[PDB]
Write an enzyme that holds these catalytic residues in place. Sequence first.
Site, PDB file in Angstrom:
ATOM      1  N   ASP A 154     129.168 -60.334 -30.751  1.00  0.00           N
ATOM      2  CA  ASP A 154     129.477 -59.271 -31.739  1.00  0.00           C
ATOM      3  C   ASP A 154     130.808 -59.574 -32.404  1.00  0.00           C
ATOM      4  O   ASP A 154     131.681 -58.730 -32.464  1.00  0.00           O
ATOM      5  CB  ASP A 154     129.501 -57.908 -31.060  1.00  0.00           C
ATOM      6  CG  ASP A 154     129.578 -56.758 -32.024  1.00  0.00           C
ATOM      7  OD1 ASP A 154     129.276 -56.928 -33.222  1.00  0.00           O
ATOM      8  OD2 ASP A 154     130.001 -55.671 -31.593  1.00  0.00           O
ATOM      9  N   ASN A 193     136.689 -56.257 -33.862  1.00  0.00           N
ATOM     10  CA  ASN A 193     136.792 -56.743 -32.482  1.00  0.00           C
ATOM     11  C   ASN A 193     138.033 -57.635 -32.262  1.00  0.00           C
ATOM     12  O   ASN A 193     138.540 -57.769 -31.135  1.00  0.00           O
ATOM     13  CB  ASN A 193     135.430 -57.318 -32.021  1.00  0.00           C
ATOM     14  CG  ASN A 193     134.406 -56.187 -31.793  1.00  0.00           C
ATOM     15  OD1 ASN A 193     134.832 -55.065 -31.520  1.00  0.00           O
ATOM     16  ND2 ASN A 193     133.097 -56.458 -31.865  1.00  0.00           N
TER      17      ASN A 193
END
Length: 271
Positions: A133, A138
């Site tokens: 991901d 992130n």
Amino acid sequence: GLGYGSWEIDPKDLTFLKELGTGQFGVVKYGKWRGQYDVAIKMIKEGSMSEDEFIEEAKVMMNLSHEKLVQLYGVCTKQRPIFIITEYMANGCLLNYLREMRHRFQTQQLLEMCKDVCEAMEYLESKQFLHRDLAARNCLVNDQGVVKVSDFGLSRYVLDDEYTSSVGSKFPVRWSPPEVLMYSKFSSKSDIWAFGVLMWEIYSLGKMPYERFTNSETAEHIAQGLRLYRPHLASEKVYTIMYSCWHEKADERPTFKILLSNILDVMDEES
Ligand SMILES: C=CC(=O)N1CCC(CNc2ncnc(N)c2-c2ccc(Oc3ccccc3)cc2)CC1
Ligand SMILES: [Cl-]
């Protein structure tokens, strides 16, 4: 010491100093370990994670070490909620950092962010570890402006099915290649695709990819072979690199080693 394995931190050694906010697993705090060492402490909300599987995987993650990868220090598992203890990134998530126009970034700084992430991903690839991901939301930024990759592999342990497959309302459609959207085929090459989208996010100062489209419309667009287009701040050479990550044929996309070489060549040429 007694009662703790090498992957386990004694939560009594933690001092909590500041809340960093809430994510889909719950709260994250800044604090100290044994009075002196900065850490981030991610507290995993009850019911959100496949805990035994994550704890076994944390053992593997402890062995990952790279300057552009957020370092896992250990986990606190004797109690609930469980804690993930990591290196502290003082300037927060990359997505929010990019959106702060006060920084007035030069394109050389944006290319360096891309290189930071690429180095981390080249390392993960050498360890046959998929991120699964990768996205600006992130990545994290430290007090020196260095970007590091975070939350690597973590999506594997999320129990909320809105997150876990395409037919889910919170799946990262906008970072997914056609073979993931069509067939759920994850590979090194789906991380490559996502990295290209991340380069687009960086050069777009944190715009949402396909910003005028829904996720459903994005999946259609991609499936029909259409793509993001060049951010204003990207040179033709930088655009070529991000665009190479989006070949319809997974096997025609570069590796992270190749992308790193391409990024270094552009830095040299654009220095
Ligand atoms: C746009 C995103 C956003 O708003 N934010 C702010 C809130 C949120 C803060 N988190 C952090 N903030 C500073 N330093 C950190 N180290 C962490 C952090 C600690 C632990 C983590 O868990 C993992 C790490 C690596 C493998 C797996 C698990 C992950 C990250 C994330 C980004
Ligand atoms: Cl920091």
